[PDB]
Write a protein that binds this ligand. Structure first.
Ligand SMILES: CSCCC(=O)C(=O)O
Ligand SMILES: [Co+2]
Length: 179
């Protein structure tokens, strides 16, 4: 199953796992209290998968494309991966389905402590509008992912602090309502 954990107190080498000691694993159930949802799919079938279609229709993920984060092939690579990793939020869901490779999504918990979520081939995640998060490659330095969106996408990150947005206010209101 999908692995998530609280992080250690080192700020060095962000692509390493940074597991807290002793281990403090985080379950899919705890992630749901943060509004973070997850599905496991057969990523070999991504071009034609009834199971992905079910999720997309349920959630109205009407838009998708594919992105490959590779030191060589990605245009403006160095600036892009810097922007992914700055703590930020969006006014829309961030939905990513890992087709190849791997990476980490870090998200803030209810006490603003970092949880690291390890995403691998087959893993699909949605980070709710308003959640503070960031993304980094892991030490394998490669990921290929499907991006999905509810309608035509707007990718704009708002780097923390971004507390004034309605999407953030509504998300805080959502957090009051979960366990
Ligand atoms: C695994 S997708 C690459 C990261 C990304 O697209 C983002 O942080 O917005
Ligand atoms: Co983001």
């Amino acid at each position: 199953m999908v692995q998530a954990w609280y992080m250690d107190e080192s700020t060095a080498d962000p692509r390493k796992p940074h597991r807290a000691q002793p281990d403090r694993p985080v379950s899919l159930e705890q992630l749901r209290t943060l509004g973070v949802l997850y599905w496991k799919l057969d990523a070999d079938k991504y071009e034609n998968d009834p199971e992905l279609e079910k999720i997309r229709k349920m959630r109205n993920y009407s838009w998708m494309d594919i992105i490959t984060i590779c030191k060589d092939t990605l245009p403006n690579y160095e600036e892009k991966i810097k922007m992914f990793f700055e703590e930020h939020l969006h006014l829309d869901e961030e939905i990513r389905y890992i087709l190849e490779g791997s990476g980490y999504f870090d998200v803030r918990d209810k006490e603003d402590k970092w949880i690291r979520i390890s995403m691998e081939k087959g893993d699909m995640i949605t980070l709710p509008a308003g959640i503070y998060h960031r993304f980094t490659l892991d030490e394998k330095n490669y990921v290929k992912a499907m991006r999905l969106f509810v309608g035509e996408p707007v990718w704009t990150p708002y780097n923390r602090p971004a507390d004034h947005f309605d999407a953030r206010v509504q998300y805080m209101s959502f957090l009051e309502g979960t366990a």
